[PDB]
Structure formats: structure tokens, C-alpha cells
Amino acid sequence: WFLATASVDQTVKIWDLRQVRGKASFLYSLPHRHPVNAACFSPDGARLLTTDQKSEIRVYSASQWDCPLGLIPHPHRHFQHLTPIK
DNA sequence: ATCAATATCCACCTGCAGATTCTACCAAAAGTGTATTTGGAAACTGCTCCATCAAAAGGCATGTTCAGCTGAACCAGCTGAACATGCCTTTTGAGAGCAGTTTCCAAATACACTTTTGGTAGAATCTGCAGGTGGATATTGAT
Incomplete structure (x- = not known):
């Protein structure tokens, strides 16, 4: 009974x-x-993974969702005809 | 020169990707009226410019002369065009950033009046530099 959602916003x-x-x-x-x-x-x-479109990965924890534990920088840049990366 | 090869020119046909034409509107052109400028007629002055003279002097016209240069012939060689080809690089088609508008305002900046005020015209002094004077080098060419 807790949910996660991601958006272009x-x-x-x-x-x-x-x-x-x-x-x-x-x-x-x-x-x-x-x-x-x-x-x-x-x-x-307890560990949420999040992955952007330009160059970043973030890990948020159960403990205080707001602040991150760590950033894993790695480029997976977006493109039209490419399938988005997960 | 003659004939084969072969690209280029040129007739004939079709359709569709760009040209052209219709239509409902809003930013733009234009006519009044006023105010607000502004540049040409009129009248004058004074600096600078146009036609003359005179005593040199330094530059131009003309005339000799010869060292060194500009094409013309010719050519060893190099080097960059013409083709086979295969092979590999370049074309084509299947969501979010950011240029382009819009609100609207905290900030920026023109403009009327005065008050200074450093900049400028013009008189009154400085002195480094255009000349000169002379001596010592440094190129140059002959030999």
C-alpha cells in the first residue's frame, strides 16, 4: 500500500x-x-531506484525519501526512435 | 582523312509537388486638426583664397653607356589524369527541447529647471629640434 510513479514533470x-x-x-x-x-x-x-534521461541515477531510501543516499552517474541519453532505458 | 563507340541534343507523355488563385479578417494607410518645430530669404563681416612678381636652386629633359635581365628552344623525368572494381560509406523512413508569443511589473531612464563648473579662446612665455659644422667610420667596387 505504497506506490511509486514517475513523470516528465x-x-x-x-x-x-x-x-x-x-x-x-x-x-x-x-x-x-x-x-x-x-x-x-x-x-x-526499502531501496528505490530512479533513472533519468540525461545523465544520472539516484537511490532513495525508506528512511526520509527526500534526500538521496547516492548518485550513480552514467549516460543513457534519450532519443526519439530509441527505446527508453530502464 | 574515314568509320565505330558513345555521350549529348532533342521529340513525345504523365502526374504531382510546388504555383496560383479565392475568402474572412486585423494591423496598417490615410485624412483632420493642431501644435511644434525647422531651414531658407535678408543682411554683414573677416579669414582665407586667386592672379602677380622677383631672386635662386634644385629638379626635369635629353643623351651616352654598358651589366645584367626576359623570353625562346629543348628536354629528363615526374607526376598527375583515365579506368576496372569491389567495397564500403552515405541516403531514406519508422517524443521533449526550445524558438516563438504573451502579462505585466520593479527597475531603468528621458526631460524641465538651476547650479555649478572644467573646457576652450586667446595672450604670453619655454625649449627640443631643423639646421649647421666637422670628424670619424662603413659600405662598395677595382684590382
């Missing part, structure tokens, strides 16, 4: 699907400098 949002109903009465919001191509949870559940 340069933000990635963590929801609580049972509690929220109010059109962005969300739980947490993490910003970025560029768009996001993927936001995938762990198997254990």
Missing part, C-alpha cells in the same frame, strides 16, 4: 493508494533536474 511521486483521494494530496515528492524514465522498487522494499 521532472518529479517522481510516492503515493499511499488507500489514503489519498484529493488530486495531489500525495505522500511524498522527490524532484529532479531532468525527466525520469524509470522508478523501480527493490525486492526488499
Whole structure:
């Protein structure tokens, strides 16, 4: 009963699907400098991976979603006819 | 020169990718009226410019002379055009950044009046430099 979603708005949002109903009465919001191509949870559940379109990877933790633990810089640049990277 | 090869010129046909033409509108042209300038008629002065003279002097016209240069012939060689080819580099087609508008305002900046005020015209002094004077070198060419 917590959810993750990613968007071209340069933000990635963590929801609580049972509690929220109010059109962005969300739980947490993490910003970025560029768009996001993927936001995938762990198997254990405590580590969120996030992957942008220009050059970055971020790891956010269970503990205080806002601040990141670590950045893994690596270029996976976006392109029209290319399949986006995950 | 003659004949083969072969690119270029030139007739004839079709369709579609760009040319041309219709239509409803909004930024732009134009007519009034006023105010607000501004540049040409009129009238004058004074610096600088146009036609003359006179005593040199330094530059131009003309005339000799010869060292050194500009094509013309010719050619060893090099080096860069013409073709086979295969092979590999260049064309074509299947979402988010950013140029281009729009609001609208905190900040920037023209403009009326005065108050200074450094810059400029013009008189009154400096002195480094155009000349000169002379001696010692440094190129140059003959031999």
C-alpha cells in the first residue's frame, strides 16, 4: 500500500493508494533536474531506484525519501526512435 | 582523312509537388486638426583664397653607356589524369527541447529647471629640434 510513479514533470511521486483521494494530496515528492524514465522498487522494499534521461541515477531510501543516499552517474541519453532505458 | 563507340541534343507523355488563385479578417494607410518645430530669404563681416612678381636652386629633359635581365628552344623525368572494381560509406523512413508569443511589473531612464563648473579662446612665455659644422667610420667596387 505504497506506490511509486514517475513523470516528465521532472518529479517522481510516492503515493499511499488507500489514503489519498484529493488530486495531489500525495505522500511524498522527490524532484529532479531532468525527466525520469524509470522508478523501480527493490525486492526488499526499502531501496528505490530512479533513472533519468540525461545523465544520472539516484537511490532513495525508506528512511526520509527526500534526500538521496547516492548518485550513480552514467549516460543513457534519450532519443526519439530509441527505446527508453530502464 | 574515314568509320565505330558513345555521350549529348532533342521529340513525345504523365502526374504531382510546388504555383496560383479565392475568402474572412486585423494591423496598417490615410485624412483632420493642431501644435511644434525647422531651414531658407535678408543682411554683414573677416579669414582665407586667386592672379602677380622677383631672386635662386634644385629638379626635369635629353643623351651616352654598358651589366645584367626576359623570353625562346629543348628536354629528363615526374607526376598527375583515365579506368576496372569491389567495397564500403552515405541516403531514406519508422517524443521533449526550445524558438516563438504573451502579462505585466520593479527597475531603468528621458526631460524641465538651476547650479555649478572644467573646457576652450586667446595672450604670453619655454625649449627640443631643423639646421649647421666637422670628424670619424662603413659600405662598395677595382684590382
